[PDB]
Design a protein around this nucleic acid. Structure first.
Lengths: 95, 70, 90, 106, 144, 134
RNA sequence: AAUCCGGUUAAUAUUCCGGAACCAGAAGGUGGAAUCAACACGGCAACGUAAAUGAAGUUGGAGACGUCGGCGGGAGCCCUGGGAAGAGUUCUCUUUUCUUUUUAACAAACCACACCCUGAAAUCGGUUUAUCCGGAGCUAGGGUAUGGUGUUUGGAA
């Protein structure tokens, strides 16, 4: 279910990939959801979590690795962290 | 081993007590080389104009021992 | 295909016997293969010495303890699972 | 033309490191040179440090202070990225111990 | 003996960022953050040229026969020849010129406007009046 | 929006690495001289020394003296925190011109110093004024 | 820790002589900087600056490291096109055959693989002789660092 909603969100809503794009969006406050891969470095996970709690944003720790998250996104590069600005047709924010 | 591009400071090092002798070099390409033996370094100054070299030479204090081309 | 069967063992030539070279072949392809790093996911883990597996990923640089020829062994994996279930029960 | 060692040490070793010069007298001659210096390495990541020359240990003593270090916290002992990890990890764990204390105090 | 001040020019409502004196010495052009360019004559102290047309700096030309003043406003530089001079001065100033792009009102006798990527801070004139050096602090490679 | 005036942040790069600063003004949109999302901050370079009840008044003042610094820092080099500092008297003093003319920069540094001195004496923002150990 | 050149003796020389340097340690002195906001500023940054106090205690680094295989740079030798000085050959032929045509330690200025910034990349791209690299931020644009057995002078003709 989480994979399907993530796939639909990128086809409907707004999203940014990677670390610095995610970090900038949290800084601007437009970010609504944060996806963090399983093998994200522990310091990177905590600083993103601190950014999210400042910005009052939800955080989801994706069970699969960064490769798994990128494959679930369908792009052919590994993604460690992404920020969902808008859910669009998906309801990823509620669940 | 110390090239000096400033005339005054060449003069001042010449007046300084560490200075022991000065030397004059006249190269074939017509530039004048004022070398100043000091305690630790040898300060040399290259001048392209003869009359500036001459006025510099008379500007050296008399007590300094000046030697011509070796 | 330069060599149909011998593979990496072609350096040893005709010596040491067929079976005594085939088991080296399986072990040697394991030993020199590149493994996916558990911490960064980049395929940058390579053996350093017997038991040492270093990640050359810029920013990861993590060293690992593992098997002599392969990063993870069956015995270590079984031990990790049994210890995990024992701790959860305890 | 051929050269000989200036010192009484034959057997080119690490200390018997030599160079060829041509003298003002038109002579091919050896020049005995010292080994090369090393840039100081980072304490945490092991990368060489940026902003310091590569000199032998005692030759570091002739430099000025600012020529051997970098103006930053841990500068000259840790790389910039290593220091940045030190700072963020320090702050984040400090916030945790505060939040754990606030959790357990009630 | 540059003794105590005896003549005071007033009329600028803000900081006067830069002021320059013409080679003739009878004209003093000043400007500042208000953007108002004021030309004063030293002999009597009037402000005959009140036309305003932030003013970083302004400097006269070295040629007396071509009294052209260059003013740096933000990133734009104006080559202004006020009509206060005799007419032949205006004609003589034109033939001097008539990266940075060039373009060609209460006596708004504008001649050439130069636009620069950064806000010009310092202005310098060559002795022959053909070279203009504009310096800005923000940029590095093309600062000057 | 988490980088707002009055928010305490940590400088992670530069000479003042690991120093606690207060967001004085955010220009996240950018500028001609700074095409990135910078923010001008005021912080502490030399933290006031620890004080003891046994110490005399002259040393209490001597250790309580604090040396501030004003700097424009990139967002990526700033680490925002949950702490907030009330920047009274410190609302309008910084502008692009205040950096251009150092006389306004020097005046800003002096005003920032006297505000930090008074706030430290008042005993507010204890976390802001204690040095961060790393 | 720190020395080079030229020369000299019947026999010694990186040791003597002439010239030119360098290192270690010691003391106060001149000049400059910081300082009553005691312990400097600049750059977003990597970091820079002629300076820019730091006891005890702790910690890091240099010293400090195998082997083979190509690839790139440098220096010396080798090769080579003219010039100039002598010398070889010349019955004939050879604008030619040969020798010479040099520049040390040291001081000074200058000189782009790691890193930083902007940026967000699938028509995936960059790139090596050798397929490694990238949403953990590629290419690209602009920087920072390392700076000699390189360059320009001084030495030094």
């Amino acid at each position: 279910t989480i994979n399907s909603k993530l796939a639909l969100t990128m086809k409907s809503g707004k999203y940014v990939l990677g670390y610095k794009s995610t970090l900038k969006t949290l800084r601007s406050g437009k970010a609504k959801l944060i996806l963090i891969a399983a093998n994200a470095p522990p310091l990177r996970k905590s600083e993103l979590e601190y950014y999210a709690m400042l910005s009052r944003c939800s955080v989801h720790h994706y069970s699969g690795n960064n490769i798994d998250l990128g494959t679930a996104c369908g792009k052919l590069f590994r993604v460690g962290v992404l920020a969902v600005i808008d859910a669009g047709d998906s309801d990823i924010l509620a669940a | 081993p110390r090239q000096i591009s400033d005339i005054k400071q060449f003069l001042e090092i010449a007046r300084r007590k560490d200075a022991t002798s000065a030397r004059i070099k006249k190269n074939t390409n017509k530039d004048v080389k004022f070398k100043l033996r000091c305690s630790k370094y040898l300060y040399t100054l290259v001048v392209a104009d003869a009359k500036k070299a001459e006025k510099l030479r008379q500007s050296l204090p008399p007590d300094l021992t000046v030697t011509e081309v070796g | 295909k330069r060599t149909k069967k011998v593979g990496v063992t072609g350096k040893y030539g005709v010596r040491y016997g067929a079976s005594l070279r085939r088991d080296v072949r399986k072990i040697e392809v394991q030993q020199h293969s590149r493994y996916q790093c558990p911490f960064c996911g980049r395929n940058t883990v390579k053996r350093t010495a017997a038991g040492i597996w270093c990640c050359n990923g810029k920013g990861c640089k993590k060293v690992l303890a593992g098997g002599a020829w392969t990063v993870t062994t069956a015995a270590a994996t079984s031990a990790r699972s049994t210890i995990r279930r024992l701790r959860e029960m305890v | 033309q051929r050269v000989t060692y200036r010192r009484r040490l034959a057997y080119n070793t690490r200390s018997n490191r030599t160079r060829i010069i041509k003298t003002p007298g038109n002579n091919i001659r050896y020049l005995h040179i010292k080994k090369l210096g090393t840039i100081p390495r980072c304490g945490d990541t092991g990368v060489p440090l940026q902003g310091i020359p590569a000199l032998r240990p005692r030759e570091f003593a002739r430099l000025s202070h600012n020529k051997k270090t970098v103006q930053r916290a841990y500068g000259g002992c840790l790389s910039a990225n290593a220091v940045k990890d030190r700072i963020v990890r320090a702050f984040l764990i400090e916030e945790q111990k505060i939040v754990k204390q606030k959790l357990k105090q009630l | 003996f540059p003794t105590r001040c005896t003549n005071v020019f007033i009329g600028h409502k803000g900081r006067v960022r830069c002021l320059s004196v013409h080679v003739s010495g009878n004209w003093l052009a000043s400007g500042g953050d208000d953007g108002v360019l004021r030309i004063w004559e030293v002999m009597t102290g009037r402000c005959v040229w009140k036309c305003s047309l932030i003013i970083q700096s302004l400097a006269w030309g070295p040629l007396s026969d071509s009294p052209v003043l260059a003013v740096a406003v933000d990133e734009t530089v104006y080559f202004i020849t006020p009509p206060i001079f005799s007419d032949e001065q205006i004609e003589a100033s034109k033939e001097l010129f008539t990266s940075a792009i060039w373009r060609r009102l209460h006596g708004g006798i504008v001649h050439a406007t130069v636009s620069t990527p950064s806000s010009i801070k310092s202005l310098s004139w060559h002795r022959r009046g053909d070279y203009l050096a504009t310096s800005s602090p923000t940029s590095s490679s093309q600062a000057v | 929006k988490i980088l707002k005036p009055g928010k305490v942040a940590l400088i992670t790069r530069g000479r003042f690495a690991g120093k606690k600063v207060v967001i004085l003004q955010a220009i996240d949109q950018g500028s001609k001289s700074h095409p990135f999302g910078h923010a001008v901050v005021a912080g502490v370079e030399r933290y006031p020394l620890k004080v003891t009840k046994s110490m005399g008044a002259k040393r209490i003042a001597r250790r309580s003296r604090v040396k501030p610094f004003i700097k424009v820092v990139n967002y990526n080099h700033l680490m925002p925190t949950r702490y907030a500092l009330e920047l009274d008297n410190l609302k309008g003093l910084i502008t692009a011109d205040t950096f251009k003319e150092p006389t306004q920069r020097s005046a800003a540094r002096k005003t920032v110093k006297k505000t930090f001195e008074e706030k430290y004496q008042s005993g507010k923002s204890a976390w802001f004024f204690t040095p961060l150990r790393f």
